[PDB]
Design a protein around this nucleic acid. Structure first.
Ligand SMILES: [Mg+2]
Ligand SMILES: [Mg+2]
Ligand SMILES: [Mg+2]
Ligand SMILES: [Mg+2]
Ligand SMILES: [Mg+2]
Ligand SMILES: [Mg+2]
Ligand SMILES: [Mg+2]
Ligand SMILES: [Mg+2]
Ligand SMILES: [Mg+2]
Ligand SMILES: [Mg+2]
Ligand SMILES: [Mg+2]
Ligand SMILES: [Mg+2]
Lengths: 97, 127, 197, 91, 97, 214, 25
RNA sequence: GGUGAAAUUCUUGGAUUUAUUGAAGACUAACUACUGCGAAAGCAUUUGCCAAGGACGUUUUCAUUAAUCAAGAACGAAAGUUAGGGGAUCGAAGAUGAUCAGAUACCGUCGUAGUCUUAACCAUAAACUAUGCCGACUAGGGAUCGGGUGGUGUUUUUUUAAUGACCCACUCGGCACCUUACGAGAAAUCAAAGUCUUUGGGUUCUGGGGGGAGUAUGGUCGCAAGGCUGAAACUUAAAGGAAUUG
């Protein structure tokens, strides 16, 4: 369910992968949702909510580490955090998950 | 009107126990076994040995105050015969003979959910 | 050096003056650097924490247990070893435990232990393969190695010594009341022979 | 090309000490020289530094584990039992 | 030759059923091949009932019954005359009485 | 010669108020003295007694009750509910072939700190006009019924302090609740709790015991 | 001579034939 | 205690038996059936999680992608092997008490290995339906499990809606069963073991009198036990199957 919503965003919507580009998009206000890997360090993770809380953008806590999140977004590397720039044909933003 | 004990008749093969206790079962009152009443080693579990072994139990229940008994008949149970031995029936009839009142007869054979592999080997006890 | 289990250097703040006090714990398996240890009566039941025995449930696996409250750890200190809390006796508070050797011990419920198993377990599973690895193992411990067999010696050197063949000549099982110089063999043996009931 | 049929790493011991002993060592040396996934940074960068000390070459995190493996089965069972009792306390 | 279509047992679709132990000799028996009987006995007798009715409180209280399912090996069932070896045509009859 | 029966005191067993007549029976102990006084030789005794005996009515001929003595006052041993269990002949007469047996058990705490395991048993029933001869549930009904039973047993306990659980257990209102909540999934015939065992005792609460023994 | 016991006896002769051969080798 | 009868063994220091409380390991009774699932081996306490699967339904999609298969591989009871753990029970070995001419067997009481688990091995059973797999057709019947379809059919829940459960009638798939012998078979028997001298649907494996012998040898796999492959010299008029009478 969550994975197929992620795959639909990657297929149809626009997104950024990684810490630095996610925080830049959080600064610029272009992020509708942030998905955070389970094994992301707590300091970076709290840094990400504080940015997200400042910009009023939703935070979803992915179940699975950076390997699993990278696989979910269809990548062959780890991603510790993904930012959804705008959902495409996907209801990821509307569905609470 | 009456004073109750518990008979706890264990009727295995090769023996029978007539073990009267209090209601709690903590205090023994006249435990008499069939091996006490005969000397042949063939008929400790016989109905006659059970008759005598329950007759003197009830002769002891009176003069101590037990006037009625709840009976719990027992087989060996566990991984064994599960069938009450021959002596259990004579002991129960002997208790009823002996003027003791009877109430709430029950079978308390230990029945497992099959466990602890039965003795005898795979081919069983062949003679 | 000389210890199979690794050690955890844990830093605490002194409660009574501004400074940090360091401690040398025996690291339990699963304890990592940067992890927060919590040591007290009100500590959580998590690996690495230090708790009183009376405040852990049945079946809890602890290590470096205090034999007496305050002695700072006596029981289950070697790699892979642990103590099982097997019962509580709340009145005149005592806790029944199972030691690594299998003995049942009654400790005060206020004695402390560390949740988990001593790290480095499985060490003796690997054969040493050669004298040199035993040499380096004992070079860091003490001068107990190599060992000469008493029968290989002369009678002046050992009760097993002498003879025109290498043999012991009297029973190797020695009374508990024998005196120093006599206690070479199997002392106070209740039985001998291959352990086979 | 497959340089050895079965000795593998224990071919360094030549023909001595006995085949069963060399086999026993071989299983534990392969465990103790393997790379393991970091539970912290998700990278397969955990190597042994000494018996019981497993250090991730990235993120510099060091964990205490088995003599020849990062985690022993006994340690895994103790983790689950401690978690079970902790949730019983916290329930 | 073959004696029975249901070889000696009741197993067409298993391969393995389970063993049970003979109540008479403790022989191990596939549970489908075991000869099974249901002994429902009076807790006392067919003759001491009147005695126990006269010499007991709770007039005609329950007369409890004893239930046990007996399992017999082929040998013990034949030697105890539970199954009574039959003719070629009569062994095809599966009726109980 | 000893003859220990010229030495014991013949106490009297009293039942909790959540029953009919509380006079159960008599217990033999000792003559109390120094050097292991007889006073402590009772405080743990458990006596089984038929619910039919302690209720008068014979419809409770099965389902015996364990009564554990809590303390001794005068020539009176005050008992508290210790467990419930069906009789063996009842169970065996209840288990029949060509039907399904469904059993559920729950470990659950009362309003007091009375931890106790409730069991329950039930049997698939043939409908009237049924021609097929074996009345088996489809193993999805069985999980459905078991889930219903567990929820009901957990709901009846967690209120119902031990005294209220006993007063619920006697008239078997729980089996009417199980039947009402399972009649849609599959018909059932012999629905019973069939066993209660107390696992952990709360604080002794002598006032609570006296609330039952007047 | 039961077939499985003849098999067992033949395994004993074979087991000792492969020892005398290894010895004589 | 134990047996047909006993001995052995425990026991007035308290055995056995009664009661309360614990600990451990195994097993999962009854329900349990000519019932289910699985490729077979096998699989029976609850609940959660995970991946899978058959059948059914289908006016969905693809469109020959299939059948069977040397070589080649995955799995494969129990016993057994190695190393940890566990080691309640029963229990190859062993001890011991009996029986008997003897009994190193059956019977009795103990008892190591084993039984259980983890990580590896092994690869064999009357691993059997002694019945290869795929396809078509040939006879009647009732029961049963799973799915489906249809009854102004019962039933509880508000009185009956529905749903469930049940009843009836069909249908696909499945485990089987009964009758009969079209037909087959030497017969026993068999709805396949039928549609075979009126001999051909596709395809894989195996056998060629009885022994020697699943032996010897070589190879290969295995730590080992052993497994797979596997003769000959020689010897022999029978061995064997099914049924009949005694
Ligand atoms: Mg030496
Ligand atoms: Mg010398
Ligand atoms: Mg025959
Ligand atoms: Mg089979
Ligand atoms: Mg069961
Ligand atoms: Mg079923
Ligand atoms: Mg092949
Ligand atoms: Mg074969
Ligand atoms: Mg075959
Ligand atoms: Mg089927
Ligand atoms: Mg030929
Ligand atoms: Mg031939």
């Amino acid at each position: 369910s969550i994975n197929q919503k992620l795959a639909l965003v990657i297929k149809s919507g626009k997104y950024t992968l990684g810490y630095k580009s996610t925080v830049k998009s959080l600064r610029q206000g272009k992020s509708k949702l942030i998905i955070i890997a389970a094994n992301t360090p707590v300091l970076r993770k709290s840094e990400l909510e504080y940015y997200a809380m400042l910009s009023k953008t939703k935070v979803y806590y992915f179940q699975g580490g950076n390997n699993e999140l990278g696989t979910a977004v269809g990548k062959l590397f780890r991603v510790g955090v993904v930012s959804i720039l705008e959902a495409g044909d996907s209801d990821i933003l509307t569905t609470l998950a | 009107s009456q004073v109750f004990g518990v008979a706890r008749i264990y009727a295995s093969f090769n023996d029978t126990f007539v073990h009267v206790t209090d209601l709690s079962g903590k205090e023994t009152i006249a435990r008499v076994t069939g091996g006490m009443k005969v000397k042949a080693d063939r008929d400790e579990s016989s109905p006659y040995a059970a008759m005598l072994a329950a007759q003197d139990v009830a002769a002891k229940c009176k003069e101590v105050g037990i006037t009625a008994v709840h009976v719990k008949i027992r087989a060996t149970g566990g991984t064994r015969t599960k069938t009450p031995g021959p002596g259990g029936q004579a002991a129960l009839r002997a208790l009823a003979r002996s003027g003791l009142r009877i109430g709430r007869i029950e079978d308390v054979t230990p029945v497992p959910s099959d466990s602890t592999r039965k003795k005898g080997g795979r081919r069983g006890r062949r003679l | 050096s000389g210890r199979g289990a690794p050690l955890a250097k844990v830093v605490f703040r002194d409660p009574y003056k501004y400074r940090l006090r360091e401690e040398i714990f025996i690291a339990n398996e699963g304890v990592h650097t940067g992890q927060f240890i919590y040591a007290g009566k009100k500590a959580s039941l998590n690996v690495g924490n230090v708790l009183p025995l009376g405040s852990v449930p049945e079946g809890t696996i602890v290590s470096n247990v205090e034999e007496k409250p305050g002695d700072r750890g006596a029981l289950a200190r070697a790699s892979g070893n642990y103590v099982i809390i097997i019962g509580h006796n709340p009145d005149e508070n005592k806790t029944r435990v199972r030691l690594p050797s299998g003995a049942k011990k009654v400790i005060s419920s206020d004695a402390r232990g560390v949740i988990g198993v001593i790290a480095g377990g499985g060490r003796v599973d690997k054969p040493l393969l050669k004298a040199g690895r035993a040499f380096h193992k004992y070079r860091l411990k003490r001068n107990s190695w190599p060992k000469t067999r008493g029968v290989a010696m002369n009678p002046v050197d050992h009760p097993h010594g002498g003879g025109n063949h290498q043999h012991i000549g009297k029973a190797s099982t020695i009374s508990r009341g024998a005196v120093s110089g006599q206690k070479a063999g199997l002392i106070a043996a209740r039985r001998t022979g291959l352990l086979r009931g | 090309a497959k340089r050895t049929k079965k000795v593998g790493i224990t071919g360094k011991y030549g023909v001595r000490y006995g085949s069963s002993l060399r086999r026993q060592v071989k299983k534990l040396e392969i465990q103790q020289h393997a790379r393991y996934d970091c539970s912290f940074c998700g990278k397969k960068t955990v190597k042994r530094g000494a018996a019981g000390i497993w250090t991730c070459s990235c993120c510099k995190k060091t964990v205490a584990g088995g003599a020849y493996t990062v985690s022993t089965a006994a340690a895994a069972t103790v983790r689950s039992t401690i978690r079970r009792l902790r949730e019983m306390v916290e329930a | 030759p073959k004696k029975r279509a249901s070889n000696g047992r009741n197993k067409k679709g298993r391969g393995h059923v389970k063993p049970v132990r003979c109540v008479n000799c403790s022989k191990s028996i596939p549970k489908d091949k075991a000869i099974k009987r249901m002994a429902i006995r009076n807790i006392v007798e067919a003759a001491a009932v009147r005695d126990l009715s006269e010499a007991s409180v709770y007039p005609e209280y329950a007369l409890p019954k004893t239930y046990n399912k007996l399992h017999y090996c082929v040998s013990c069932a034949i030697h105890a005359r539970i199954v009574r070896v039959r003719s070629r045509e009569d062994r095809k009859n599966r009726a109980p009485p | 010669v000893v003859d220990p029966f010229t030495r014991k005191e013949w106490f009297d067993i009293k039942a909790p108020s959540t029953f009919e007549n509380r006079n159960v029976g008599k217990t033999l102990v000792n003559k109390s003295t120094g050097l292991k006084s007889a006073s402590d030789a009772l405080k743990g005794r458990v006596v089984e007694v038929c619910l039919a005996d302690l209720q008068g009515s014979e419809d409770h001929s099965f389902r015996k009750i364990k009564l554990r003595v809590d303390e001794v006052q005068g020539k009176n041993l005050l008992t508290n509910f210790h467990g419930m269990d069906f009789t063996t002949d009842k169970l065996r007469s209840m288990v029949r072939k060509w039907q399904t047996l469904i059993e559920a058990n729950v470990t659950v705490k009362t309003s007091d700190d009375y931890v106790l395991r409730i069991f329950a048993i039930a049997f698939t029933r043939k409908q009237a006009n049924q021609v097929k001869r074996h009345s088996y549930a489809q193993s999805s009904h069985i999980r459905a019924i078991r889930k219903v039973i567990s929820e009901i047993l957990t709901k009846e306990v967690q209120g119902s302090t031990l005294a209220q659980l006993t007063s619920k257990l006697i008239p078997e209102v729980i089996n009417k609740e199980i039947e009402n909540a399972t009649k849609d999934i599959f018909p059932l015939q012999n629905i019973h709790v069939r066993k209660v065992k107390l696992l952990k005792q709360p604080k002794f609460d002598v006032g609570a015991l006296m609330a039952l023994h007047g | 001579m039961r077939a499985k016991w003849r098999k067992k006896r033949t395994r004993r002769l074979k087991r000792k034939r492969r020892k005398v051969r290894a010895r004589s080798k």
